[PDB]
Amino acid sequence: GCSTPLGMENGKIENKQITASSFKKSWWGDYWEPFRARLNAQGRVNAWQAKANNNKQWLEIDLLKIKKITAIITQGCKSLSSEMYVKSYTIHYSEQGVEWKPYRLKSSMVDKIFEGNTNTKGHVKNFFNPPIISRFIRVIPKTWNQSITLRLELFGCDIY
Q: How many angstroms separate the CA atoms of 43 and 33, rounded?
A: 13
Domain extent listing, the chain: 1-160
3-state secondary structure of 118: coil
Nearest to 63 by CA among 127, 5, 2, 21: 5
* Signed CA dihedral, 11, 12, 17, 21: sign only: negative
The bridge status of strand 82-94 relative to strand 59-75 is unpaired
Length of the chain: 160
Residues 66, 135 contacting (CB under 8 angstroms): yes
DSSP run (H or E) holding 64: strand 59-75
Q: Resolution in A for the shown PDB structure?
A: 1.9
User: Which positions ≥6 away from 79 have C-beta within 8 Å?
Assistant: none
List the determination method: X-ray
Domain 1-160 fold is: Jelly Rolls (2.60.120)
* Cα 38 → chain centroid: 9
DSSP run (H or E) holding 90: strand 82-94
First-to-last alpha carbon distance for the chain, in angstroms, is: 12
